[PDB]
Structure formats: structure tokens, C-alpha cells
Amino acid sequence: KNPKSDKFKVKRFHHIEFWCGDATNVARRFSWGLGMRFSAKSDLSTGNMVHASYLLTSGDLRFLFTAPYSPSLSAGEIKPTTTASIPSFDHGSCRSFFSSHGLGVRAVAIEVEDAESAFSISVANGAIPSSPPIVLNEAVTIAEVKLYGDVVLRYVSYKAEFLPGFERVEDASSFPLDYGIRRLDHAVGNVPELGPALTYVAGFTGFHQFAEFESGLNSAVLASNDEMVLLPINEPVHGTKRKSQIQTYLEHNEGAGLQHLALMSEDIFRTLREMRKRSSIGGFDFMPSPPPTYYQNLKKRVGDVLSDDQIKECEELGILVDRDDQGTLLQIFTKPLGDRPTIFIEIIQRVGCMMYQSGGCGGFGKGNFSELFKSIEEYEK
Amino acid sequence: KNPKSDKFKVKRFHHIEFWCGDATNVARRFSWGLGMRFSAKSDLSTGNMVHASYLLTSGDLRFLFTAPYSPSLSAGEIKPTTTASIPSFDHGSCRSFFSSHGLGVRAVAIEVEDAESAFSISVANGAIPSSPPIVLNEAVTIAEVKLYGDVVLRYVSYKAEFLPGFERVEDASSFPLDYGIRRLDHAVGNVPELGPALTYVAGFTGFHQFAEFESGLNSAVLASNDEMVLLPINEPVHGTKRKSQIQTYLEHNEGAGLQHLALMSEDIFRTLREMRKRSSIGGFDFMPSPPPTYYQNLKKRVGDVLSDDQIKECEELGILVDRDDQGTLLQIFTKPLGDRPTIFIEIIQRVGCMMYQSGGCGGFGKGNFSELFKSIEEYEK
Numbered sequence: 001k002n003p004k005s006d007k008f009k010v011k012r013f014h015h016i017e018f019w020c021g022d023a024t025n026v027a028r029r030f031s032w033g034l035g036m037r038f039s040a041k042s043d044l045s046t047g048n049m050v051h052a053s054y055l056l057t058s059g060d061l062r063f064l065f066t067a068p069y070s071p072s073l074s075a076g077e078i079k080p081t082t083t084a085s086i087p088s089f090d091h092g093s094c095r096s097f098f099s100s101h102g103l104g105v106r107a108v109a110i111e112v113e114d115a116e117s118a119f120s121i122s123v124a125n126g127a128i129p130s131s132p133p134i135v136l137n138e139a140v141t142i143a144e145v146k147l148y149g150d151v152v153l154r155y156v157s158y159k160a161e162f163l164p165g166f167e168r169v170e171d172a173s174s175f176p177l178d179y180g181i182r183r184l185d186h187a188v189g190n191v192p193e194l195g196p197a198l199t200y201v202a203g204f205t206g207f208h209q210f211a212e213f214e215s216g217l218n219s220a221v222l223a224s225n226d227e228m229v230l231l232p233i234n235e236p237v238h239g240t241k242r243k244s245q246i247q248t249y250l251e252h253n254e255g256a257g258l259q260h261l262a263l264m265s266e267d268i269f270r271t272l273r274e275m276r277k278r279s280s281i282g283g284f285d286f287m288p289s290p291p292p293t294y295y296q297n298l299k300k301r302v303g304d305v306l307s308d309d310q311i312k313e314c315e316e317l318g319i320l321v322d323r324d325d326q327g328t329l330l331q332i333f334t335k336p337l338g339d340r341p342t343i344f345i346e347i348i349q350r351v352g353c354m355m356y357q358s359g360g361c362g363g364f365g366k367g368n369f370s371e372l373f374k375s376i377e378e379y380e381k
Numbered sequence: 382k383n384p385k386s387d388k389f390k391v392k393r394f395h396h397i398e399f400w401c402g403d404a405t406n407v408a409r410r411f412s413w414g415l416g417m418r419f420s421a422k423s424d425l426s427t428g429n430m431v432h433a434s435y436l437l438t439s440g441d442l443r444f445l446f447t448a449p450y451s452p453s454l455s456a457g458e459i460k461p462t463t464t465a466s467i468p469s470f471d472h473g474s475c476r477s478f479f480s481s482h483g484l485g486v487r488a489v490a491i492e493v494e495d496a497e498s499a500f501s502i503s504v505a506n507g508a509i510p511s512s513p514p515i516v517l518n519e520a521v522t523i524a525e526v527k528l529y530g531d532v533v534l535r536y537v538s539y540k541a542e543f544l545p546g547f548e549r550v551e552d553a554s555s556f557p558l559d560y561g562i563r564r565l566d567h568a569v570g571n572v573p574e575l576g577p578a579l580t581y582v583a584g585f586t587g588f589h590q591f592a593e594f595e596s597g598l599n600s601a602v603l604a605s606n607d608e609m610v611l612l613p614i615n616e617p618v619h620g621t622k623r624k625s626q627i628q629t630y631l632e633h634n635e636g637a638g639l640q641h642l643a644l645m646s647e648d649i650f651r652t653l654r655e656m657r658k659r660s661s662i663g664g665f666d667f668m669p670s671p672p673p674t675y676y677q678n679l680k681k682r683v684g685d686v687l688s689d690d691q692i693k694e695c696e697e698l699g700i701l702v703d704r705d706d707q708g709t710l711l712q713i714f715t716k717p718l719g720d721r722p723t724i725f726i727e728i729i730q731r732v733g734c735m736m737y738q739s740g741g742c743g744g745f746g747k748g749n750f751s752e753l754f755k756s757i758e759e760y761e762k
């Protein structure tokens with residue numbers, strides 16, 4: 001069921017913005033680890049005396065890394081005279097966010113038809129405003145409302161290159177890395193209580209629940225009209241034997257925030273070979289692999305979609321597989337991206353549901369909670 | 382002239398500690414960029430609920446990256462019950478340092494025979510104490526006094542593995558990178574006034590001035606008895622046409638701090654090939670190269686030490702060369718390590734002064750200020 005109840009026209013995921021203490025070092029680590037190119041910048045070299053912002057791209061995926069400068073550099077500016085390229089940026093907010101949460105996502109940005117319209121409708125329907133709409137160079141409109149914790153949902157609309165005031169990167173410094181990642185598939189929040197959070201977000205977006213198919217989580221997924229913008233939310237299940245990983249997140253994060261970003265690859269096998277090659281030389285580590293029992297059990301579950309060779313390939317790389325009614329999902333998770341056990345990344349590829357491919361095809365892998373436990377205990381034998 | 386006036390027995394540079402917001406991402410960037418191995422850790426996985434600290438090694442060079450956790454994780458601890466592996470660490474101090482300075486060096490650590498003795502003598506002779514001596518596991522003694530700005534000089538003595546409470550890195554995660562860097566040659570501070578700073582530091586160490594051989598700097602070098610611990614200090618020269626790079630540092634750093642770390646390599650040619658290979662894929666960028674006139678002028682200056690082929694090699698890699706009375710120095714500088722134009726790294730190799738090789742052999746390259754200007758203007762032609 002899809003009531004298609006979006007309250008404003010929503011296009012696609014546009015970008016993700018991390019708030020950090022040093023944008024240079026985080027951006028350079030991510031570039032090498034994930035194979036994303038340096039595409040644009042707004043820093044001192046471009047006249048921005050307020051914040052250092054660096055943009056990484058892979059296909060249509062945009063990761064923006066931003067950090068503050070000393071406020072003394074821009075102490076004489078006022079908002080009408082600012083040199084910031086992101087008018088919503090605030091020194092105090094950024095330092096407070098990062099000291100409270102450590103490294104993580106500040107903005108989930110989606111492209112809309114009319115950022116001004118989306119903002120007003122949103123707050124008309126209960127959104128807590130964060131940054132009012134601003135028109136950049138008469139060409140781009142940007143606005144922000146609260147999503148959960150200190151994460152904002154950013155609207156971005158274009159009348160007709162990333163943002164005004166950003167310069168393209170002189171390719172000499174812009175090495176064309178590419179491990180196969182292509183777009184952002186979904187962005188997941190952790191909250192203490194799922195009910196009030198879902199009611200708030202679906203309330204002002206009109207997004208509908210996507211509908212799915214003991215391990216410490218309850219969760220639900222909001223979706224836009226064509227189900228291409230996907231925003232799942234988790235809450236802790238307390239009192240179980242094994243401590244909830246959602247509760248651990250809220251503890252070490254100082255409350256709600258974004259849990260994982262799921263990046264779609266055009267060839268998950270090559271993405272995972274390339275990332276694993278780099279895990280120990282500046283890249284990302286992956287969660288411990290499932291036991292061979294898990295892969296011996298895959299023939300019965302997806303032996304009609306993946307060849308026996310394609311299953312052995314999953315086993316070498318530690319990929320997980322799940323399946324709903326309409327298609328199949330290959331997935332794998334990184335260890336946390338930073339010091340704290342909080343944000344992590346998921347790499348995914350979806351098989352099926354062709355009309356183009358419809359969003360959510362195969363679900364989100366909840367069936368791998370039980371299957372992982374099962375295969376672990378079979379292998380304990 | 383060497384009066385050998387050290388007021389306590391001083392051995393060698395022991396380590397450098399960076400204070401950052403996310404130790405994981407900075408450490409991983411440095412590892413790949415400089416070819417340093419992950420050697421030890423003290424974090425949540427080792428029972429440290431206070432700070433995440435990761436140690437990188439290359440030969441005898443030790444880079445320690447440290448970041449705070451949420452104070453709520455250790456809110457019930459007191460100093461007698463602390464889980465920190467570095468007793469001098471303080472949450473407030475670390476967050477205040479990094480928000481004020483961005484990424485940079487907090488501690489310059491030297492190994493002494495008696496850290497307790499060195500501390501008392503130092504403050505007896507004018508050192509401002511920072512952290513009193515603490516004995517770790519009855520095996521290591523650590524103490525800290527102020528050096529300049531918010532940089533401390535850390536004393537470390539061993540009765541007889543980095544520090545108690547640090548675990549060796551399970552080599553699976555400890556890839557053995559090595560680009561040829563071997564030890565820390567010198568560590569350089571920027572201050573507004575050189576006179577008062579030198580008087581303070583030589584005052585409590587007994588270190589002597591090392592003695593050298595318009596571009597915006599005045600500087601002097603303090604040295605220990607065998608001249609192996611080397612601590613140069615710069616001050617701005619104001620009112621010149623081209624703005625002083627020392628003044629720019631103090632502006633963007635919010636005052637005094639460490640300017641550069643000079644790492645000695647056993648083969649600067651291979652170190653620079655390896656680092657340059659990585660500049661655009663997560664490593665470090667190097668300052669713009671000198672013009673061909675500079676290298677055509679090298680035959681007359683060091684044609685008795687470097688072959689014509691060894692000079693062409695310098696030209697490919699952008700290495701600079703200087704020479705004093707006793708030996709020759711090859712050097713090159715990175716662009717800043719972070720967002721702000723503040724800290725940078727120097728790679729160096731020294732030729733000459735054999736007895737082992739005496740420290741400071743060839744000076745520090747001040748003769749390259751004029752030679753760079755000269756060759757630039759000849760090449761303007």
C-alpha cells in the first residue's frame with residue numbers, strides 16, 4: 001500500500017553533511033576508504049572565512065565534510081555580509097554538536113521542487129524550523145527543519161555547481177577514485193521512542209510507512225511518493241539478555257542521531273574487494289563475518305537468484321543476503337566510522353523489482369537478525 | 382660552543398601527542414600519508430572510558446593521536462579510580478584546546494632518566510607546572526610543564542610497552558607500512574616574541590643555544606647536551622611587504638603553538654616518492670616546487686656532495702638543499718596537515734658530521750630563504 005501522501009514535491013537524496021573538528025582529515029580518510037572523488041570546496045582559498053567545507057562524490061552520492069574556523073577570522077561579519085557558503089552554518093552550533101556527539105551526520109539533504117514551499121508546508125504541519133529559507137545567488141534555495149536529535153532535514157531546490165560559492169576542484173588534486181558506489185539508498189535514525197518520532201516526521205512530510213516482509217530493535221520506515229527517499233527509524237528494546245545496540249548508540253552519542261548510511265553500489269563484489277584491500281591502510285573495517293553455516297544455508301534461501309559461484313563470492317567477502325516478496329538484497333556493515341560506537345556505513349545492492357528499479361526492493365535485511373543467530377548456533381554445534 | 386648545561390639527564394625525543402576531535406580518522410590519514418604503523422591503542426576496547434588514544438610508529442618516531450569520549454562514560458570515576466591511560470588527560474582541556482587551535486600538537490615528549498627529578502628541577506628553575514609526576518604501574522613516570530602557548534613538554538622515564546594500559550595492536554589490523562621515516566629531528570614553536578620564550582625554556586632546561594651558519598622571521602634553536610633534542614623557536618618580523626607566515630600562524634592558531642615537526646628519513650628520495658604517490662589519495666600535499674633555476678644553481682653550491690644524478694632526483698621531487706660549515710641538509714615541507722594554515726611537516730636527511738652522526742648536522746635550512754627568492758627572480762628573468 002502506497003497512499004502517495006507527500007505534502008510537497010520531493011525528488012531525490014541530494015547530499016549528506018558531516019560536522020567535524022577537522023574537515024580535511026576526515027574527508028581525506030573517507031575519499032580513500034570509500035573511493036570518492038574530491039569535487040568541490042569552499043574554504044579560505046575561496047574566500048570563506050567562516051567554515052571549511054569539502055565535497056566528495058561517487059556517482060550521485062554526495063558527502064560534505066564541514067568544520068569551523070576560529071570565529072576571530074569573521075568577527076567583523078554579519079549575516080548580510082557573511083563569507084560562509086552555507087548560510088545555516090553557526091560556529092557555536094557546530095562546536096556544540098561535535099563535542100556532544102563526536103563525528104557524525106548533521107544534515108540529511110533531499111532535493112525538492114520548491115525549498116521555500118517545502119519549508120512553509122513542513123512547519124505548517126508541525127516541523128520545528130531550524131534555518132529559514134535562503135536564496136543563494138538567485139539560483140539555489142536552501143532550508144532546514146529538525147529531524148531527530150540534532151540532525152536536520154535540509155531542503156534544496158534549483159531554479160535551473162554544487163552550491164554558489166563552492167569552487168570545482170582543480171583536478172590535479174582530484175584523483176578519480178571509484179570503487180562502484182553510486183547513490184544513497186537510505187538513512188537511518190536511532191531514537192529512544194519510535195512512536196513519537198515517526199508521528200512527527202510523517203506528520204510534516206506526509207511520508208508513508210513502507211511496510212516490511214528480540215534482537216534488540218523495533219523499527220519502521222518512512223517513504224516518499226516514489227519510495228526513493230527512504231528514512232528508517234529504530235528504537236531500543238530494553239531488558240533483553242544481550243544489551244541493545246540501539247541503547248549503546250544513544251549512550252555513546254549523547255542521545256538520538258543518525259545510525260547508518262546505506263550506500264548503493266553497482267557491483268557490491270568489486271566495492272567490497274576494493275574497500276577490504278584498504279581496511280588496514282587508512283580505510284574502513286568491516287564487521288566480523290558470518291560463519292560458514294550461514295553460507296551453506298544460502299543455497300536453500302536464494303539458490304534461484306545467486307549462482308553457487310556468486311554465493312562463494314559472498315562468503316569470501318562476508319556479504320549478507322536477505323529476501324522479501326519482490327526482490328533480493330545483498331548487504332554488509334562497517335565498523336563505526338569514528339572513535340565512538342555510533343555511526344556506521346552499510347553497502348548494498350538490490351536485485352529485482354524492475355518496471356528502472358523500484359525503491360526498497362528486497363527490504364532492509366531484518367530477516368538477517370534471526371538467520372545470523374541461527375547460523376551462529378548451528379556452527380557452535 | 383656547547384656549554385653542556387642541561388640541568389637534568391635528557392635522553393631522546395620519545396613521542397609527539399596530537400589533540401583532536403576524532404582520533405580514529407586523523408590517525409588513519411597519517412598512517413597512510415606518512416607510512417606509519419598502528420602499534421598500540423588505549424580505548425574502549427581496552428577499558429579506557431575516558432579517552433581514545435592511538436599510537437603510530439615508524440622506526441623510533443612515535444605519533445600519538447588522542448580524543449575525548451563523552452564525559453558521561455566516566456562521570457562516576459575519580460582520579461584514584463580513573464580508567465584513563467594518560468593521567469594528565471582532561472576532558473575540558475582537550476575540548477578547549479581543539480576548539481581554540483584546531484588540530485595540532487599538545488605534547489612534545491622527551492625521555493629523561495628521572496621524570497620526577499626533571500619536573501622538580503624544571504619548576505625549581507621557572508617552569509610552569511602542568512601535570513605533576515605520576516608513577517604508572519610502578520614502571521613508568523610521567524610529568525608535564527608548560528612549553529609555549531598550550532603545548533607542554535612531557536618528561537617520561539622508565540625504571541627498566543609504550544605506556545601501561547596500552548595494548549599492542551593485533552597485527553591483523555597493523556599493516557607494516559614504511560616509507561623510510563625513522564626519528565624526530567626537531568620540533569619548532571611559533572611565538573609572538575622570541576626573547577621571553579627562549580629565556581623561559583632555556584631557563585628551566587639548561588638547554589644551550591645551538592648557533593647557526595627579511596623573509597619574515599627571527600629564530601633561535603635550543604639544544605640539549607648531545608644536541609639530539611632540538612627545539613627551535615620563531616617570532617614574526619612585522620611591517621615587511623610580504624606578510625609574515627609566522628604572523629599568519631598566530632592569527633589562525635589563536636596564538637602560540639607548534640609550527641612544524643621535522644622527521645628524519647633514512648632515504649629521503651624514497652620517502653618523497655612514496656608520499657607524493659599518495660598526495661591525492663588521502664595523503665599529504667607538498668609545497669610548490671622551486672623553479673629550475675634553483676636546481677641549476679645547486680651544482681655550484683653542493684656539487685661536491687651530491688652527484689649530478691642526485692641533483693636531478695632532487696629536482697623531480699622538489700627537495701631543497703642547504704649547507705652549513707659541517708654538513709649538508711636535504712629538506713622539503715608539506716602543506717598544512719589540517720584545515721587551518723598552521724602546523725605542517727618537514728622531511729629531512731642530513732649528510733656529514735660523522736664521529737654516529739652529530740645532531741643539527743647542516744643546520745635547519747635558513748639559507749634557503751634567500752636562495753629561493755634569488756632563483757625565483759632569476760627565473761622571472
Ligand SMILES: CCCn1c(=O)c2c(C)c(C(=O)C3=C(O)CCCC3=O)ccc2n(C)c1=O
Pocket residue numbers: 186188217219220232233234260262287333346364365366368369372
Ligand atoms: C553490528 C551489525 C548488526 N546488524 C545491523 O546493524 C543491521 C542493520 C543496521 C540493518 C539495517 O540496515 C536496518 C535498516 O536499514 C532498517 C531498520 C532496521 C535495520 O536494522 C539490517 C541488518 C543488520 N544486521 C543483520 C545486523 O546484524
Ligand SMILES: CCCn1c(=O)c2c(C)c(C(=O)C3=C(O)CCCC3=O)ccc2n(C)c1=O
Pocket residue numbers: 567569598600601613614615641643668714727745746747749750753
Ligand atoms: C611555506 C614554506 C616556507 N619555508 C619554510 O617554512 C621553511 C622552514 C620552516 C624552515 C625550518 O625548518 C626552520 C627551522 O627548522 C628552524 C627555524 C627557522 C626555520 O624556518 C626552513 C626553511 C623554510 N623555507 C626555506 C621556506 O621556504
Ligand SMILES: [Co+2]
Pocket residue numbers: 186188260262346364
Ligand atoms: Co540499512
Ligand SMILES: [Co+2]
Pocket residue numbers: 567569641643727745
Ligand atoms: Co625545520
